[PDB]
Amino acid sequence: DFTPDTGVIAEMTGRPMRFDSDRYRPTDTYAEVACDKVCRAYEGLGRESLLAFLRDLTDPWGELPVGTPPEDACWVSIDGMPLETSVAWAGRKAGVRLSLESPRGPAKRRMEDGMALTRRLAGRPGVSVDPCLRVEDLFTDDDPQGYFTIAHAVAWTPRYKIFLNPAVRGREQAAARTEEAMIRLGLEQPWRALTEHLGGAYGPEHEPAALAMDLVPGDDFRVQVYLAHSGVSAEAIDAKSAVAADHVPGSFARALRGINGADPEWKRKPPVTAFSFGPGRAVPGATLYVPMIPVHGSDAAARDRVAAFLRSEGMDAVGYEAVLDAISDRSLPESHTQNFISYRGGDSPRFSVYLAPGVYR
Numbered sequence: 001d002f003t004p005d006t007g008v009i010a011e012m013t014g015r016p017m018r019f020d021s022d023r024y025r026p027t028d029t030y031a032e033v034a035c036d037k038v039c040r041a042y043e044g045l046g047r048e049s050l051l052a053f054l055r056d057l058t059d060p061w062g063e064l065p066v067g068t069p070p071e072d073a074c075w076v077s078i079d080g081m082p083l084e085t086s087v088a089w090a091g092r093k094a095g096v097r098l099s100l101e102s103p104r105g106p107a108k109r110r111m112e113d114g115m116a117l118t119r120r121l122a123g124r125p126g127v128s129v130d131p132c133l134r135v136e137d138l139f140t141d142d143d144p145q146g147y148f149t150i151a152h153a154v155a156w157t158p159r160y161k162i163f164l165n166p167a168v169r170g171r172e173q174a175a176a177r178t179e180e181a182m183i184r185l186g187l188e189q190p191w192r193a194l195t196e197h198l199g200g201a202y203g204p205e206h207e208p209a210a211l212a213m214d215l216v217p218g219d220d221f222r223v224q225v226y227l228a229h230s231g232v233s234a235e236a237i238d239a240k241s242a243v244a245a246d247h248v249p250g251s252f253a254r255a256l257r258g259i260n261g262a263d264p265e266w267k268r269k270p271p272v273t274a275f276s277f278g279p280g281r282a283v284p285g286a287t288l289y290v291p292m293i294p295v296h297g298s299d300a301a302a303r304d305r306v307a308a309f310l311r312s313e314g315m316d317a318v319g320y321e322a323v324l325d326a327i328s329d330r331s332l333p334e335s336h337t338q339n340f341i342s343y344r345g346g347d348s349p350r351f352s353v354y355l356a357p358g359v360y361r
């Protein structure tokens, strides 16, 4: 949580973008791309209403032409697009999610668009935005710093989450804003347990980079704190999640080493642990996020290694590859769209892949 050689990376933010797609016309709208990407994800898993849902959800920018790159890349996708598709497998369930972030600028405006969407979600079936509004001032400012401020995701079975940036006013304050948010939400107990497990402080070795929460009421409510791990071994990362309710000793270290090799310029993108908190749960759960592009030279190279890992865990590698194949617009050895995968082992294993549309370069 200090120097520029640590923490999360800019990805496409701050860089100029050109449209470059074999699949989409420049006149296709953001909402149409999203609709297409989501349908193709379900296809890999084995439409007029969906596009209307998504145009609604992304209103107004959803009608903007994809062919005209934003002044400012979004951070939700590594190719700077305002949308990122993910597919998640949990135990015997599998489903599709879409994350989204306003492409509009500048940052205060993009933030405000995000605040506006929260309020348009407030009245939707099963949604509660009260916990979000309780902590929202900790993550917003007139002059927001960092790579993002507010993004959202929808998951269909519609469930919504919000992503918030504790580094909105600098990395040095991230832990404090995170802590205050956890206390306000009544999650002081598991937060303390995590904090004490990590040694009582937060630095680049386990740095609060994002706070997410499911926008729902009741014991179902869930907060995730994402900690980026700059400059530490696979074994050290594994040890950090030993406080977790669902910790499997060595599992994270094995996934990290197995998929991403030993800790070289393109391994600047730090691995991340998502600690998940809920009401009446005294310690968090933990989920591992393994960096894909650009640690790996292409989606094909990443795919081979992730497929081999899934198999050794006895998880469904065929479904993962089918999703990659269905959703990707380029031949995989020349494709660079996988952002992360996430993983948890044990008796209720979880695997997810997060995919840039692959439209901007």
Ligand SMILES: CC(C)[C@H]1C(=O)N[C@H](CO)Cc2c[nH]c3cccc(c23)N1C
Pocket (backbone or CB within 6 Å): 008, 009, 011, 075, 076, 077, 078, 084, 209, 210, 226, 228, 269, 272, 289, 339, 340, 354
């Ligand atoms: C802050 C984490 C959630 C985040 C991260 O550390 N870096 C990503 C860019 O390298 C941001 C990101 C965008 N979409 C994502 C989907 C799943 C995890 C992500 C992201 N990170 C691990």
Ligand SMILES: CC(C)=CCSP(=O)(O)OP(=O)(O)O
Pocket (backbone or CB within 6 Å): 084, 086, 088, 099, 153, 163, 342, 352
């Ligand atoms: C889109 C970003 C930044 C993170 C997504 S992590 P996640 O939504 O897959 O976490 P869950 O699957 O809801 O537990």
